[PDB]
Amino acid sequence: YDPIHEYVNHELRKRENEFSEHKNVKIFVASYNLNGCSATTKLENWLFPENTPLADIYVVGFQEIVQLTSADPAKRREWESCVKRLLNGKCTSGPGYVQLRSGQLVGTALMIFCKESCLPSIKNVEGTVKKTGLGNKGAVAIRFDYEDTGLCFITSHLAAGYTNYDERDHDYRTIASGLRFRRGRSIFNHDYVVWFGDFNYRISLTYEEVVPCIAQGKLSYLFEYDQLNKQMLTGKVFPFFSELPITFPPTYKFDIGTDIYDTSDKHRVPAWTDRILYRGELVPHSYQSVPLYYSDHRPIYATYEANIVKVDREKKKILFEELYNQRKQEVRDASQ
Ligand SMILES: O=P(O)(O)O[C@@H]1[C@H](O)[C@@H](O)[C@H](OP(=O)(O)O)[C@@H](O)[C@H]1O
Numbered sequence: 001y002d003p004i005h006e007y008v009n010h011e012l013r014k015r016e017n018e019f020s021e022h023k024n025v026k027i028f029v030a031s032y033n034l035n036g037c038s039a040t041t042k043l044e045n046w047l048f049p050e051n052t053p054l055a056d057i058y059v060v061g062f063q064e065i066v067q068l069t070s071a072d073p074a075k076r077r078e079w080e081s082c083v084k085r086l087l088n089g090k091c092t093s094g095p096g097y098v099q100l101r102s103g104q105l106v107g108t109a110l111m112i113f114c115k116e117s118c119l120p121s122i123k124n125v126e127g128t129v130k131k132t133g134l135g136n137k138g139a140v141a142i143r144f145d146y147e148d149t150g151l152c153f154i155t156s157h158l159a160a161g162y163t164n165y166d167e168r169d170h171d172y173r174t175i176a177s178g179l180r181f182r183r184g185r186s187i188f189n190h191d192y193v194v195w196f197g198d199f200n201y202r203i204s205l206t207y208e209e210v211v212p213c214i215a216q217g218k219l220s221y222l223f224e225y226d227q228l229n230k231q232m233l234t235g236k237v238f239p240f241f242s243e244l245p246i247t248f249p250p251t252y253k254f255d256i257g258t259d260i261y262d263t264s265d266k267h268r269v270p271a272w273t274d275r276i277l278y279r280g281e282l283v284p285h286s287y288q289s290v291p292l293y294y295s296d297h298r299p300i301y302a303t304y305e306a307n308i309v310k311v312d313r314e315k316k317k318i319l320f321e322e323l324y325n326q327r328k329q330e331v332r333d334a335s336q
């Protein structure tokens with residue numbers, strides 16, 4: 001401990017604008033449990049849902065690239081090619097988007113694209129995966145620094161089952177403790193973290209109770225029975241993560257190709273299985289499901305603005321030393 005050093009950091013904090021520049025980066029986060037459906041570029045409603053500018057960074061997570069009943073890199077690459085074609089298709093003049101990196105754990109995959117113009121700012125990209133224990137479930141994560149701000153993205157597919165939310169909570173803990181990038185870096189060591197996917201948490205009511213409530217728009221009532229909300233409220237899972245209020249209907253269990261909830265004999269209770277949660281000072285904007293019908297789940301997305309800082313380290317070290325000396329001499333004089 002050094003009092004003079006503390007003093008300097010305190011003062012310097014007041015003069016940050018002298019060695020720091022701040023910028024807002026737009027980030028589009030998209031999630032889709034595919035039920036093993038084929039890759040296609042017909043995703044416009046999902047990836048360009050709003051009448052707003054294209055994002056700087058697109059973070060796309062898929063579950064069940066192979067329908068669940070050994071990891072297919074080929075199928076993941078078809079999706080990569082489809083997303084890239086779609087993003088560049090909107091870039092009629094000049095530079096488009098490039099894939100920074102992708103990762104995969106069995107049927108779960110995460111791929112991140114950014115504008116070519118963002119590339120010079122992106123550094124220390126790392127990726128890792130972690131399977132769940134208590135198998136085809138788990139997480140895929142990619143992190144990177146954008147100038148001097150650290151971001152970490154995680155997509156997952158957690159334990160399936162109507163009542164086994166204790167196993168999903170266990171999966172959360174397994175992944176939060178188990179995901180490690182280079183040199184033991186954890187997911188929490190970042191300014192912004194977005195963790196999302198098919199967490200599989202369910203609404204704890206019966207099919208016959210839930211369906212008419214959905215049809216009647218009683219989403220607030222149903223959310224009172226959502227297992228994820230219940231476990232987050234107690235700090236048991238995803239502590240310090242936030243979720244925007246859900247204004248869209250349960251994204252799971254639909255007959256494929258239709259607006260109809262599961263009419264199979266399995267009469268699966270609808271649920272908000274697909275979620276996007278964030279930790280850190282992101283500014284959230286949208287959070288919605290989109291009407292694509294290729295799977296028994298609807299895809300979802302969330303948008304954010306992320307404040308980025310670029311620090312002139314050289315210029316800051318100089319001010320620091322100057323302020324530090326000035327203060328040490330001041331204390332010297334006071335002793336005289
Ligand atoms: O594979 P799907 O289409 O997601 O269907 C799953 C099903 O496979 C079981 O894992 C299950 O039942 P259980 O109640 O016995 O845990 C769960 O409720 C269903 O939603």
Ligand SMILES: [Ca+2]
Nearest residue numbers: 035064068296
């Ligand atoms: Ca499925």
